[PDB]
Design a protein around this ligand. Structure first.
Ligand SMILES: CC(=O)N1CCN(C(=O)N2CC[C@](c3ccc(C(O)(C(F)(F)F)C(F)(F)F)cc3)(S(=O)(=O)c3ccc(F)cc3)C2)CC1
Length: 223
């Protein structure tokens, strides 16, 4: 493919993302002032770990649906065999949610948008996972500090889903070509937007997997 075809791929991936971004960026930034009261935090803190794991897993399932809808809106992904479409979505859907999460994160007060309002990491106190909640706040802080754009999330998550390294793939070569083109599309877009600077400042690829595997470990016990 040509440089015009790489540009078209960027546009397409960014179009698919915007159509499935779940919550509008403009809405999320406006709601940054809409913070939960002390009695509202207390209300969540009083809830059972099972009630909180039920709510979090409900929102996670909901978020994963938009991720599946994002991958379904990618031409190359649809061309893959069903087993490969499943293998990539099972291994990457939750990792994509953890990346998408930075839009709902506010670095000015260390709060995240959860159930209509912004709340601190003390909102999730009931789970008994202070280490795990800190880990997802720190990860969203590492991306929000960089001011990770909508298009940047779009291309990064496309690379998270399309990874030929995943075990269980039959058409590894086909996925490799899709990964290579998206890698080329990501770097080309960073040049066009003068964001080459953020590449070295991004999470060390393997960290997202370390964070996700530790979370599925805690989740599998309750779901
Ligand atoms: C704007 C946008 O696209 N968004 C923002 C709103 N959404 C979220 O942020 N979502 C949807 C579900 C969210 C979510 C649920 C559960 C986890 C866990 O790691 C857990 F251990 F923490 F529980 C897992 F259960 F996996 F173990 C992680 C994320 S959430 O909103 O419930 C949430 C946000 C911040 C947070 F500290 C904790 C939870 C993330 C969806 C994506």
């Amino acid at each position: 493919a040509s440089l015009t075809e790489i540009e078209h791929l960027v546009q397409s991936v960014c179009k698919s993302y915007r159509e499935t971004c779940q919550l509008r960026l403009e809405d999320l930034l406006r709601q940054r002032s809409n913070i939960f009261s002390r009695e509202e935090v207390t209300g969540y803190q009083r809830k059972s770990m099972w009630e909180m794991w039920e709510r979090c897993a409900h929102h996670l399932t909901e978020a994963i649906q938009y991720v599946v809808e994002f991958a379904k809106r990618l031409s190359g992904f649809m061309e893959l065999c069903q087993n490969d479409q499943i293998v990539l979505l099972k291994a990457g859907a939750m990792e994509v949610v953890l990346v998408r999460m930075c839009r709902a994160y506010n670095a000015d007060n260390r709060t995240v948008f959860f159930e209509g309002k912004y709340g601190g990491m003390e909102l999730f106190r009931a789970l008994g996972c202070s280490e795990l909640i800190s880990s997802i706040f720190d990860f969203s802080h590492s991306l929000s500090a960089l001011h990770f754009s909508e298009d940047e999330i779009a291309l990064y998550t496309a690379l998270v889903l399309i990874n030929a390294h995943r075990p269980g793939l039959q058409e590894k070569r086909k996925v490799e070509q899709l990964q290579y083109n998206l890698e080329l599309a990501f770097h080309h877009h960073l040049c066009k937007t003068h964001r080459q600077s953020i590449l070295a400042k991004l999470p060390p690829k393997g960290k997202l997997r370390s964070l996700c595997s530790q979370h599925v470990e805690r989740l599998q016990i309750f779901q």
